[PDB]
Design an enzyme around this catalytic site. Sequence first.
Site, PDB file in Angstrom:
ATOM      1  N   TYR C  61      -7.329  15.562  -2.669  1.00  0.00           N
ATOM      2  CA  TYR C  61      -6.379  14.224  -3.169  1.00  0.00           C
ATOM      3  C   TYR C  61      -6.841  14.314  -4.931  1.00  0.00           C
ATOM      4  N   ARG C  71       1.116  12.373 -15.947  1.00  0.00           N
ATOM      5  CA  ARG C  71       2.552  12.235 -16.038  1.00  0.00           C
ATOM      6  C   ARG C  71       2.746  11.232 -15.521  1.00  0.00           C
ATOM      7  N   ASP C  75       4.899   9.368 -18.942  1.00  0.00           N
ATOM      8  CA  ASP C  75       6.308   7.995 -18.345  1.00  0.00           C
ATOM      9  C   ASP C  75       6.140   7.033 -18.543  1.00  0.00           C
ATOM     10  N   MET C  79       7.853   5.085 -22.048  1.00  0.00           N
ATOM     11  CA  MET C  79       8.882   4.207 -21.770  1.00  0.00           C
ATOM     12  C   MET C  79       8.671   2.146 -22.964  1.00  0.00           C
ATOM     13  N   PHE C 103      11.749   5.753 -15.476  1.00  0.00           N
ATOM     14  CA  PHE C 103      11.197   4.650 -14.814  1.00  0.00           C
ATOM     15  C   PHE C 103      10.962   5.051 -13.464  1.00  0.00           C
ATOM     16  N   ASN C 124     -11.194  10.403   3.116  1.00  0.00           N
ATOM     17  CA  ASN C 124     -11.726  11.925   3.535  1.00  0.00           C
ATOM     18  C   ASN C 124     -12.807  12.119   3.248  1.00  0.00           C
ATOM     19  N   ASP C 135     -16.654  15.636  11.729  1.00  0.00           N
ATOM     20  CA  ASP C 135     -15.906  16.423  10.777  1.00  0.00           C
ATOM     21  C   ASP C 135     -14.554  15.012  11.604  1.00  0.00           C
ATOM     22  N   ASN C 142      -5.259  16.721   9.297  1.00  0.00           N
ATOM     23  CA  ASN C 142      -5.340  15.974   7.819  1.00  0.00           C
ATOM     24  C   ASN C 142      -5.195  17.345   6.663  1.00  0.00           C
ATOM     25  N   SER C 145      -1.026  16.677   6.536  1.00  0.00           N
ATOM     26  CA  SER C 145      -0.761  15.792   5.405  1.00  0.00           C
ATOM     27  C   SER C 145      -1.117  16.559   4.279  1.00  0.00           C
ATOM     28  N   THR C 149       1.692  16.000   1.438  1.00  0.00           N
ATOM     29  CA  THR C 149       1.483  15.557   0.532  1.00  0.00           C
ATOM     30  C   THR C 149       1.637  16.188  -0.988  1.00  0.00           C
ATOM     31  N   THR C 201       1.415  10.681   5.162  1.00  0.00           N
ATOM     32  CA  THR C 201       0.631   9.606   5.665  1.00  0.00           C
ATOM     33  C   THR C 201       1.043   9.007   6.863  1.00  0.00           C
ATOM     34  N   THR C 204      -1.836  11.204   8.679  1.00  0.00           N
ATOM     35  CA  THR C 204      -3.137  10.588   7.796  1.00  0.00           C
ATOM     36  C   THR C 204      -4.175   9.568   8.469  1.00  0.00           C
ATOM     37  N   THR C 211     -10.277   8.823  14.633  1.00  0.00           N
ATOM     38  CA  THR C 211     -11.489   9.286  14.211  1.00  0.00           C
ATOM     39  C   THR C 211     -12.516   7.862  14.238  1.00  0.00           C
ATOM     40  N   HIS C 284       5.390  -4.519   1.448  1.00  0.00           N
ATOM     41  CA  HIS C 284       4.184  -5.885   1.546  1.00  0.00           C
ATOM     42  C   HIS C 284       3.170  -4.874   2.195  1.00  0.00           C
ATOM     43  N   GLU C 286       2.233  -2.145   2.822  1.00  0.00           N
ATOM     44  CA  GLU C 286       1.654  -0.562   1.705  1.00  0.00           C
ATOM     45  C   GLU C 286       0.341  -1.518   0.813  1.00  0.00           C
ATOM     46  N   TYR C 288      -1.230  -3.534   0.601  1.00  0.00           N
ATOM     47  CA  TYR C 288      -3.063  -3.942   1.386  1.00  0.00           C
ATOM     48  C   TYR C 288      -3.619  -2.903   1.458  1.00  0.00           C
ATOM     49  N   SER C 299     -17.306  -3.238  -1.960  1.00  0.00           N
ATOM     50  CA  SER C 299     -18.927  -4.181  -1.283  1.00  0.00           C
ATOM     51  C   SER C 299     -19.886  -2.780  -1.194  1.00  0.00           C
ATOM     52  N   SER C 315     -18.201 -12.778   7.303  1.00  0.00           N
ATOM     53  CA  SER C 315     -17.095 -13.072   6.862  1.00  0.00           C
ATOM     54  C   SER C 315     -15.970 -12.379   6.369  1.00  0.00           C
ATOM     55  N   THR C 359      -9.631 -13.258   0.268  1.00  0.00           N
ATOM     56  CA  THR C 359      -9.442 -12.597  -0.898  1.00  0.00           C
ATOM     57  C   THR C 359      -9.843 -13.186  -2.031  1.00  0.00           C
ATOM     58  N   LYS C 362     -14.019 -13.263   0.090  1.00  0.00           N
ATOM     59  CA  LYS C 362     -14.396 -11.647  -0.236  1.00  0.00           C
ATOM     60  C   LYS C 362     -15.228 -11.667  -1.787  1.00  0.00           C
ATOM     61  N   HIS C 419       2.085  -9.829 -13.762  1.00  0.00           N
ATOM     62  CA  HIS C 419       1.396  -9.410 -11.775  1.00  0.00           C
ATOM     63  C   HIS C 419       1.197  -8.293 -11.062  1.00  0.00           C
ATOM     64  N   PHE C 420       2.189  -7.347 -10.675  1.00  0.00           N
ATOM     65  CA  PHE C 420       2.259  -6.106  -9.950  1.00  0.00           C
ATOM     66  C   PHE C 420       0.775  -5.014 -10.591  1.00  0.00           C
ATOM     67  N   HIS C 421       1.165  -4.783 -12.160  1.00  0.00           N
ATOM     68  CA  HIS C 421       0.602  -3.957 -13.394  1.00  0.00           C
ATOM     69  C   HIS C 421      -0.866  -4.545 -12.711  1.00  0.00           C
TER      70      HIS C 421
HETATM   71  C1  HEO Z   1      -2.377  -3.534  -5.908  1.00  0.00           C
HETATM   72  C2  HEO Z   1      -1.313  -3.856  -5.245  1.00  0.00           C
HETATM   73  C3  HEO Z   1      -0.812  -5.169  -4.733  1.00  0.00           C
HETATM   74  C4  HEO Z   1      -1.514  -6.553  -3.955  1.00  0.00           C
HETATM   75  C5  HEO Z   1      -2.403  -6.407  -2.986  1.00  0.00           C
HETATM   76  C6  HEO Z   1      -0.802  -7.895  -3.631  1.00  0.00           C
HETATM   77  C7  HEO Z   1      -0.789  -8.828  -3.596  1.00  0.00           C
HETATM   78  C8  HEO Z   1      -0.259 -10.020  -3.454  1.00  0.00           C
HETATM   79  N1  HEO Z   1       0.997 -10.015  -4.551  1.00  0.00           N
HETATM   80 FE1  HEO Z   1       1.073  -9.206  -6.198  1.00  0.00          FE
HETATM   81  N2  HEO Z   1       0.749  -7.396  -5.160  1.00  0.00           N
HETATM   82  C9  HEO Z   1       0.103  -5.982  -5.794  1.00  0.00           C
HETATM   83  C10 HEO Z   1       1.466  -5.463  -6.344  1.00  0.00           C
HETATM   84  C11 HEO Z   1       2.362  -6.015  -6.029  1.00  0.00           C
HETATM   85  N3  HEO Z   1       2.319  -7.197  -5.118  1.00  0.00           N
HETATM   86  C12 HEO Z   1       4.157  -6.691  -5.294  1.00  0.00           C
HETATM   87  C13 HEO Z   1       4.881  -8.606  -5.190  1.00  0.00           C
HETATM   88  C14 HEO Z   1       4.529  -9.711  -5.459  1.00  0.00           C
HETATM   89  C15 HEO Z   1       5.127 -10.241  -5.668  1.00  0.00           C
HETATM   90  C16 HEO Z   1       6.900 -10.553  -4.802  1.00  0.00           C
HETATM   91  C17 HEO Z   1       7.192 -10.265  -6.138  1.00  0.00           C
HETATM   92  C18 HEO Z   1       8.564 -12.127  -6.713  1.00  0.00           C
HETATM   93  O1  HEO Z   1       8.630 -12.793  -6.116  1.00  0.00           O
HETATM   94  O2  HEO Z   1       9.337 -11.503  -7.637  1.00  0.00           O
HETATM   95  C19 HEO Z   1       4.529 -11.853  -5.381  1.00  0.00           C
HETATM   96  C20 HEO Z   1       4.741 -13.490  -5.073  1.00  0.00           C
HETATM   97  C21 HEO Z   1       2.519 -11.273  -5.112  1.00  0.00           C
HETATM   98  C22 HEO Z   1       1.720 -11.861  -5.541  1.00  0.00           C
HETATM   99  C23 HEO Z   1       1.045 -11.861  -4.957  1.00  0.00           C
HETATM  100  C24 HEO Z   1      -0.308 -12.515  -3.773  1.00  0.00           C
HETATM  101  C25 HEO Z   1      -0.054 -13.690  -4.124  1.00  0.00           C
HETATM  102  C26 HEO Z   1      -1.045 -10.685  -3.337  1.00  0.00           C
HETATM  103  C27 HEO Z   1      -2.232 -11.942  -2.649  1.00  0.00           C
HETATM  104  O3  HEO Z   1      -1.981 -11.211  -1.079  1.00  0.00           O
HETATM  105  C28 HEO Z   1      -3.497 -11.416  -2.850  1.00  0.00           C
HETATM  106  C29 HEO Z   1      -3.740 -12.238  -3.945  1.00  0.00           C
HETATM  107  C30 HEO Z   1      -4.994 -11.999  -4.823  1.00  0.00           C
HETATM  108  C31 HEO Z   1      -5.938 -13.174  -5.248  1.00  0.00           C
HETATM  109  C32 HEO Z   1      -4.887 -14.243  -4.539  1.00  0.00           C
HETATM  110  C33 HEO Z   1      -7.401 -13.008  -5.408  1.00  0.00           C
HETATM  111  C34 HEO Z   1      -7.564 -14.106  -6.639  1.00  0.00           C
HETATM  112  C35 HEO Z   1      -8.566 -15.595  -5.587  1.00  0.00           C
HETATM  113  C36 HEO Z   1      -9.808 -15.977  -5.808  1.00  0.00           C
HETATM  114  C37 HEO Z   1     -10.698 -15.976  -6.991  1.00  0.00           C
HETATM  115  C38 HEO Z   1      -9.415 -17.705  -4.948  1.00  0.00           C
HETATM  116  C39 HEO Z   1      -9.398 -18.824  -5.686  1.00  0.00           C
HETATM  117  C40 HEO Z   1      -7.999 -19.366  -4.754  1.00  0.00           C
HETATM  118  C41 HEO Z   1      -7.249 -19.616  -4.642  1.00  0.00           C
HETATM  119  C42 HEO Z   1      -6.047 -18.912  -5.336  1.00  0.00           C
HETATM  120  C43 HEO Z   1      -6.491 -20.408  -3.329  1.00  0.00           C
HETATM  121  N4  HEO Z   1       2.731 -10.463  -5.226  1.00  0.00           N
HETATM  122  C44 HEO Z   1       4.793  -5.624  -5.744  1.00  0.00           C
HETATM  123  C45 HEO Z   1       6.207  -5.598  -5.466  1.00  0.00           C
HETATM  124  C46 HEO Z   1       7.318  -5.285  -7.274  1.00  0.00           C
HETATM  125  C47 HEO Z   1       8.346  -4.643  -7.172  1.00  0.00           C
HETATM  126  O4  HEO Z   1       9.306  -5.788  -6.321  1.00  0.00           O
HETATM  127  O5  HEO Z   1       8.524  -3.593  -7.174  1.00  0.00           O
HETATM  128  C48 HEO Z   1       3.822  -4.857  -5.874  1.00  0.00           C
HETATM  129  C49 HEO Z   1       3.967  -3.943  -6.428  1.00  0.00           C
HETATM  130  C1  HEM Z   2      -1.318   3.132 -16.542  1.00  0.00           C
HETATM  131  C2  HEM Z   2      -1.194   1.892 -17.570  1.00  0.00           C
HETATM  132  C3  HEM Z   2       0.309   1.574 -16.338  1.00  0.00           C
HETATM  133  C4  HEM Z   2       1.021   1.270 -17.480  1.00  0.00           C
HETATM  134  C5  HEM Z   2       1.318   1.100 -19.164  1.00  0.00           C
HETATM  135  C6  HEM Z   2       2.622   1.269 -16.826  1.00  0.00           C
HETATM  136  C7  HEM Z   2       3.910   1.195 -17.896  1.00  0.00           C
HETATM  137  C8  HEM Z   2       5.008   0.000 -17.181  1.00  0.00           C
HETATM  138  C9  HEM Z   2       6.218  -0.728 -17.818  1.00  0.00           C
HETATM  139  C10 HEM Z   2       6.486  -0.454 -19.012  1.00  0.00           C
HETATM  140  C11 HEM Z   2       6.935  -0.129 -16.302  1.00  0.00           C
HETATM  141  C12 HEM Z   2       8.054  -0.783 -16.311  1.00  0.00           C
HETATM  142  C13 HEM Z   2       8.462  -2.291 -16.874  1.00  0.00           C
HETATM  143  C14 HEM Z   2      10.076  -2.584 -17.166  1.00  0.00           C
HETATM  144  O1  HEM Z   2      10.851  -2.701 -16.254  1.00  0.00           O
HETATM  145  O2  HEM Z   2       9.865  -3.195 -18.175  1.00  0.00           O
HETATM  146  C15 HEM Z   2       6.674   0.408 -15.383  1.00  0.00           C
HETATM  147  C16 HEM Z   2       7.167  -0.092 -14.195  1.00  0.00           C
HETATM  148  C17 HEM Z   2       6.500   0.364 -12.926  1.00  0.00           C
HETATM  149  N1  HEM Z   2       5.459   0.805 -12.211  1.00  0.00           N
HETATM  150 FE1  HEM Z   2       3.823   0.802 -13.751  1.00  0.00          FE
HETATM  151  N2  HEM Z   2       1.907   1.450 -15.950  1.00  0.00           N
HETATM  152  C18 HEM Z   2       1.304   1.555 -15.386  1.00  0.00           C
HETATM  153  C19 HEM Z   2       0.530   2.026 -14.295  1.00  0.00           C
HETATM  154  C20 HEM Z   2       0.956   1.763 -13.477  1.00  0.00           C
HETATM  155  C21 HEM Z   2       0.317   2.347 -12.298  1.00  0.00           C
HETATM  156  C22 HEM Z   2      -1.439   2.385 -11.950  1.00  0.00           C
HETATM  157  C23 HEM Z   2       1.298   1.740 -10.610  1.00  0.00           C
HETATM  158  C24 HEM Z   2       1.191   2.108  -9.060  1.00  0.00           C
HETATM  159  C25 HEM Z   2      -0.157   1.419  -9.073  1.00  0.00           C
HETATM  160  C26 HEM Z   2       2.250   1.593 -10.995  1.00  0.00           C
HETATM  161  C27 HEM Z   2       3.324   0.738 -10.552  1.00  0.00           C
HETATM  162  C28 HEM Z   2       4.353   0.540 -11.704  1.00  0.00           C
HETATM  163  C29 HEM Z   2       6.187   0.070 -11.041  1.00  0.00           C
HETATM  164  C30 HEM Z   2       5.632   0.126  -9.432  1.00  0.00           C
HETATM  165  C31 HEM Z   2       7.075  -0.055 -11.672  1.00  0.00           C
HETATM  166  C32 HEM Z   2       8.111  -0.650 -11.440  1.00  0.00           C
HETATM  167  C33 HEM Z   2       9.501   0.616 -11.379  1.00  0.00           C
HETATM  168  C34 HEM Z   2      10.937  -0.004 -11.409  1.00  0.00           C
HETATM  169  O3  HEM Z   2      10.600  -1.068 -12.246  1.00  0.00           O
HETATM  170  O4  HEM Z   2      11.700   0.574  -9.959  1.00  0.00           O
HETATM  171  N3  HEM Z   2       1.983   1.614 -12.841  1.00  0.00           N
HETATM  172  N4  HEM Z   2       5.114   0.353 -15.908  1.00  0.00           N
HETATM  173 CU   LIG Z   3       4.819  -9.080  -2.106  1.00  0.00          CU
END
Ligand code: HEO
Ligand code: HEM
Ligand SMILES: [Cu+2]
Lengths: 260, 260, 658, 96, 96, 184, 184
Positions: C61, C71, C75, C79, C103, C124, C135, C142, C145, C149, C201, C204, C211, C284, C286, C288, C299, C315, C359, C362, C419-421
């Site tokens: 894995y 790869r 990409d 981009m 993309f 694993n 095991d 496993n 699975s 993948t 998955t 898995t 287990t 969503h 996924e 977590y 931890s 806690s 969070t 933690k 945010h998500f990156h």
């Molecule tokens: C690791 C990946 C991952 C995780 C765990 C999360 C968890 C969270 N996501 Fe980011 N999301 C992640 C990656 C993405 N989220 C997304 C979608 C997404 C959206 C919807 C997109 C939109 O509206 O356009 C929101 C609003 C957020 C916010 C958050 C929040 C509040 C959490 C929370 O569950 C956790 C946040 C962590 C916190 C809050 C810790 C910081 C806090 C401390 C230290 C305490 C301070 C106290 C306070 C702030 C009260 N997530 C998408 C979809 C993108 C797409 O559209 O394709 C991806 C890939």
């Molecule tokens: C290592 C550095 C990384 C860079 C520089 C990068 C860069 C980018 C860029 C430029 C985009 C396009 C955003 C746009 O539309 O303008 C993108 C999209 C995305 N990336 Fe990455 N990325 C990285 C890592 C990751 C990783 C580790 C993940 C997942 C775990 C991830 C998940 C995604 C997803 C889900 C999208 C959205 C695709 C879509 O819009 O259809 N990226 N990334």
């Molecule tokens: Cu979400």
Amino acid sequence: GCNSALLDPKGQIGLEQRSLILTAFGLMLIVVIPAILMAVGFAWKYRASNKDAKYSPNWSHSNKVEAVVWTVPILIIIFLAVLTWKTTHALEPSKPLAHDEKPITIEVVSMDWKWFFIYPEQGIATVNEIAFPANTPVYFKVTSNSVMNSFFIPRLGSQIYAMAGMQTRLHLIANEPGTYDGISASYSGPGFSGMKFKAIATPDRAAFDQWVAKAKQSPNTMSDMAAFEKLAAPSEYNQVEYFSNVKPDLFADVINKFMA
Amino acid sequence: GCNSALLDPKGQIGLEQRSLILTAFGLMLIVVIPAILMAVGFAWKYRASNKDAKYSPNWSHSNKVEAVVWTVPILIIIFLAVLTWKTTHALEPSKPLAHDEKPITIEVVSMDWKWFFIYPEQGIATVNEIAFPANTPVYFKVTSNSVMNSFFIPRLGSQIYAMAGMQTRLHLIANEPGTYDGISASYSGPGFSGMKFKAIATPDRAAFDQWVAKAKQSPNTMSDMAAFEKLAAPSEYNQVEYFSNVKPDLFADVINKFMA
Amino acid sequence: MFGKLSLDAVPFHEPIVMVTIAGIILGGLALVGLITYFGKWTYLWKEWLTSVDHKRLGIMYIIVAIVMLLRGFADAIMMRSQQALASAGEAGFLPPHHYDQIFTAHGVIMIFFVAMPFVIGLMNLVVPLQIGARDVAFPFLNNLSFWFTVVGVILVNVSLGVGEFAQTGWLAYPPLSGIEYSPGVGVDYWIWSLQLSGIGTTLTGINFFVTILKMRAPGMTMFKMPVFTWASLCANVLIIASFPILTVTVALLTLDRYLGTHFFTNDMGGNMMMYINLIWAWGHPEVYILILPVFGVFSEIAATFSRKRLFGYTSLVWATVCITVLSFIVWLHHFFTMGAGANVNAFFGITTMIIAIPTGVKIFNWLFTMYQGRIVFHSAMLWTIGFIVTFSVGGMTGVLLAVPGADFVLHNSLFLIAHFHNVIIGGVVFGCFAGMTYWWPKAFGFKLNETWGKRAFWFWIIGFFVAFMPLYALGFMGMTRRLSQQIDPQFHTMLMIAASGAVLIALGILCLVIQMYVSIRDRDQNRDLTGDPWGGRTLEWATSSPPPFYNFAVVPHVHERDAFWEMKEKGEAYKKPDHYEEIHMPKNSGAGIVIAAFSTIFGFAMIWHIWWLAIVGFAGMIITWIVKSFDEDVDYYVPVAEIEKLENQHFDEITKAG
Amino acid sequence: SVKTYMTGFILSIILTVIPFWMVMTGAASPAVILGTILAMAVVQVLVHLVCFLHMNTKSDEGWNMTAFVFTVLIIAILVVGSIWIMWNLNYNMMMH
Amino acid sequence: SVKTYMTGFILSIILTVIPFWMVMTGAASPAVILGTILAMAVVQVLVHLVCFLHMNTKSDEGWNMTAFVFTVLIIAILVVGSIWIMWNLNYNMMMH
Amino acid sequence: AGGTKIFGFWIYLMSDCILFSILFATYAVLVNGTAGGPTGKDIFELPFVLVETFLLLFSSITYGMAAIAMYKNNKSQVISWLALTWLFGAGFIGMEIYEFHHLIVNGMGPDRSGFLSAFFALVGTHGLHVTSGLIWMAVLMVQIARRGLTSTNRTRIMCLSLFWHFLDVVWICVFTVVYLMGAM
Amino acid sequence: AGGTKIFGFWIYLMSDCILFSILFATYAVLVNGTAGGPTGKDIFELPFVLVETFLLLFSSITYGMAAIAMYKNNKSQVISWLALTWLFGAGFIGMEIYEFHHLIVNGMGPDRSGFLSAFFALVGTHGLHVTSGLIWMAVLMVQIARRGLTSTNRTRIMCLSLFWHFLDVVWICVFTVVYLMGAM
Ligand code: HEO
Ligand code: HEM
Ligand SMILES: [Cu+2]
């Protein structure tokens, strides 16, 4: 009682309320009746006297039995709670009735040990009597000149409270013409038993206009707060009275007496 | 960015949204900043190299510390959630703006890789351009002729989706006259980058009437579905276009194309 | 040979795809040549390719995740370069037809085939060792699975070679991904890749969930497990409860694409919005699944390197349980701009904000674990500190985005991508590298080079800031996602800075590769003799640095929270058992790779509408499964002699080193 | 035992026959004809689980049941959530 | 120790001075002047409990804290319930 | 033995928390009760409330120092700290009585309006609580002077510590909700 | 050993419960999807569904008798009961295939409307589940005939019991929601 006031109502609101009571009764029976039946059954069948009865002095938990015990009440409460939400949002006294005929406004001031009613549109006043045509919505604006009371016509439908300096809204429609009894459902003092009035659902409008004209012929007038206060003197078992001339805004002045 | 589109908006909705963003930022800082500060502080002060630092290899739980850790996030989330509820109920795009001036209705049909706008009251049509007088509410009825899109003017305020056979409501008002950029916030295909238009908030009504009259002078007319379909051909980076004569119910026909 | 497949399915004209294919095929040919020359085909077949063993499948894995990261990042570079060139008023070198493919493929690979493989690899590798089991509950499951993948990975890679990939984003929203608006075979590649990966998955998830609960070491109650096992159990619960939603959603879309049904079509009463809801209902949870195990890792690291007991165990476990419960009632926060009522938007906003508290709890527990401990600045500890610093800002931006008011302008803007990156790079990949460097001795028996590790960490964190902080500003400036051509010149400067950030991250990745190379080269000088390199608290460090195929000669007895730490404190850590007993173990099975090959054939035939080949593939899968259901010789017995020999060798190593 | 399986079979026959006969004849108000059939279905759901369904070890009597309960809460979240969200999303796009 | 009491005293001085000075000068919007003083009050509430307050045995550290938590939930029910009910009951009796 | 008594007094303080929460709810409902009478803005002097808050906080700190001294097994230090705490409490009660007298004499008593009645009820309840604490301090000091630091005396000092700190917390809530928010 | 496998299959059935709940939600949303096409009332024959329900219930009871016989350590009884269960299942699948063929031939296929597509999806998913159960019964019977009642065989029979009873529960929910409620 088959011929009871609530189980044989004459108003619409009474009819939906009776239907709701019967549906609730039916839903609760499905669980309550088995409880009493099993109580009597287990008391008789598994008595100390019986020898053939199975004895289990260590069977103290059952996952199946616990699941069955928890589930059925939860489901019954879910169904009856959905019904409760729908009916409660659909039977709010503070909600205008859906009907073609325009509602008739009646103001209900609750004096000490008597009932006072005002028809502002018709500009008349009555003591211990009301009248309104059948199959016509009636809009009650209820307040208390004194201690809390409860406006209630059992046959027509829902009751409400009368409180000092507060207007409360109620709606009632009569499907069948006739005379219905009206009481107070909140103890106001020694003369509380006295509070009794009659609601006359006239067969047609013309009878209602005749009653209004008869009330208009009363020698007595309610034009000033002094006359209102003179009537508001503590009295018991007050007879039906009529007043021809009424102040345009008397209900407003009665509420504003308490500056609210 | 100090001079950014969202941090320096020109529309009202933009202004409340910026205020909400700043308030949220402020509330989250009070907890986030201490987290990073304590991370760096505990990394430096209590390193293996330090000898004077207090060593506690058995202090593994604290009721005071746990209470402090749990409480502050809960309180911050409570305050920001109350603010969230108020703002969300007060910033719904499907909600008419409170203003003296009557709102101007604009219909937004989202063709493949271009924007189409209809003024039914003025009875004109435009491609990749809109105009409306400043300090006047604008009511957008947005639908998609094809694949999902997202109507968005960053400076004016909130965005919305455009979906086939579905009308979605939006409201926007411009406080300052000028030209603002408008894009699509949902990827619709190869020509998605192409989707770009200009919103002209005219200083006064007279300029808006002059623009409407100029659009009325267009030789092209949109009177039948055949002309609409001819325009709806897949095209990329479409220039600003005008159409004088518009079918009274074109938006309705565009929605009813999908029988919804 | 039949269906849509022809000589026109391979892009002869396009140079970039052809040079990429040439690179991949020459790489494959060179690897095959090297394997043949060294004659290690047999060794891989009986010890790696077909191993029920959990450690081998974990390492494999990790290998798959690492090779797919290259790869994905290629990409990402392409981009970023295209965006930088397009911002300067240039036509660039990537047409939209290629940018959309790039993309979509990048998103799919980096979510499904980089994060999840690495995380499940770590599970694993360590989860069976930590709970004191020999095991997993279902070893063959496993292996199957893993191969499913690998099938998904193969389909995604071969999509470049023959035909095209999906041009509808990484989630394939219905109206664009419909048969009317996407006549291409790319969406079929996406469908079948994700379907088979999802099946793998789900299997898995079920395997790990069974287990953890059923095969715990005797005397280890639920509230005495290491925190990583708690996080893994929560993640597997999420997998089981979530992945069916993805399976059903992709099945409905493929029914729409193949049989011409009207689930998500814009006409004949199809409800397109439904798909979005369903995908986000899966979407969503996924994330977590990606973030819960890595928390555990941190931890564990926080326990190991602070040289003190972890703070607020109760806690932490209650916080992760709360996150698991709350991660099912928050999905609508993805489409506040859909146009749902004020009530629904406000409710989903509030419930999305609520999940922030655990969070934060933690993070504060980790901070107070570092409170009065002796902190060693190892690679893993640097990764943990960087993770805390980055993830705090990520979470801040997240809770800011969760407000519908802010979301009405920050949705699909580069603020969302920032945010998500930000949160992914902060948590997932940081925890991945931290776990890889922390558990490397338990996988190979030698340590990683610390200098190259520290260089890679510094490059990664600095590059990530430089590449993604400008995306916050760009999101604020109103620049939306997935822009390819005629980008507004006002967005040039920030994007150029982002480009700089990108190449910085590139150096980091290069550093990582170099690290591994030198770690392999100087293995003879950095061997883990004692089996306890950093004095870890959990049972996994009780075994030799190369763990035997049987994890424990005798299943350990646990009385306390940190089993190995208590064993070391009591002074009974390395005691020779009186006698060893014959150990029941499962045999290596070769049916997993056969089922994988048949599934690959079936998927490929389904994509290219080769009906007979798809029927042959499906029949092959079912027949192989039925045939393997017959044989009973699936398990063997390890004799006392071999166990005694390995244990004596390990104890001799302990005595000589000690 | 055979007794519990036969009891389950008889209860299943009754809880299948009654709803079918009630619907085909329109013997009540539609509200009652919906509520009662849903009630009998969930009871009948419980009937099959209580009698026909049986675990061998019975060992995790606490556990297996906890798994079953959790599998429900998630369904009650997902189905009700989806129905409510789509009801709201369909009410907000009607031509009004 | 004396140290924790002195720390609590200093934090209490700060969390009392700031709200008083802020209100007497109108240094912000009324919404902020309400939210921030409520936040500082509850923190200041926590400040006094965290530092000044001490339980000798510490024996039921689980328990005494559980009692405190429960005493809150009941307050959050009663106060919020009363305020909400009276808001609704006053809105429904206005002369409209 | 001391543990059970301290736990009992803690549960009594939780009961008292419920008691004060009911008065808080009553005041919150009747905050706008006043009709043709003084409002929050018209009568609340913020400097007076600030002086009250600082003197009660000084009382809390001095009593804390008394508890530390009792842990230090010293009699004279505990007596001196208790005397200083009682003096601060007496000052606070003096200011409250002066404020009530000023309000009553100026025809703004509890019989004037709902708002004034609720204000008087809440602040009066706090006043009686503080004066009960003061009488408890008086009896505890006269007991210490003639009995010394015994187990019973230590238990009583711990119970009075819980009571006094609880009263200071309630006063924080009072000045936040009634005085400071009213004058806003 | 059997315990772990049975628990694993139970967790897989819980996953499958989630799988079917998603299809149920999809059908519930698209129940009124049909536009200028057949509705629930127009095509649903209640007698056919009643016959299907009774035959699947007979299948469940016969398989239960097979499980009892396996507990009784008899081979012939288990084989006979499994054969009768497989025959009932084959009959049920036959009726489902006939209904689908009749719908498709009459131009009422899954490509006609959203409602028909959702109906086909849900009933088809149940059909593939039941036919998977039938193939599992076939392989299990041919294994029993040549291996006898072993521990592995007992574990497989328990897993197939859980699977079959789960399918019958899902069918109860299906005919309640789709067929019976639709025809109301
Ligand atoms: C690791 C990946 C991952 C995780 C765990 C999360 C968890 C969270 N996501 Fe980011 N999301 C992640 C990656 C993405 N989220 C997304 C979608 C997404 C959206 C919807 C997109 C939109 O509206 O356009 C929101 C609003 C957020 C916010 C958050 C929040 C509040 C959490 C929370 O569950 C956790 C946040 C962590 C916190 C809050 C810790 C910081 C806090 C401390 C230290 C305490 C301070 C106290 C306070 C702030 C009260 N997530 C998408 C979809 C993108 C797409 O559209 O394709 C991806 C890939
Ligand atoms: C290592 C550095 C990384 C860079 C520089 C990068 C860069 C980018 C860029 C430029 C985009 C396009 C955003 C746009 O539309 O303008 C993108 C999209 C995305 N990336 Fe990455 N990325 C990285 C890592 C990751 C990783 C580790 C993940 C997942 C775990 C991830 C998940 C995604 C997803 C889900 C999208 C959205 C695709 C879509 O819009 O259809 N990226 N990334
Ligand atoms: Cu979400």
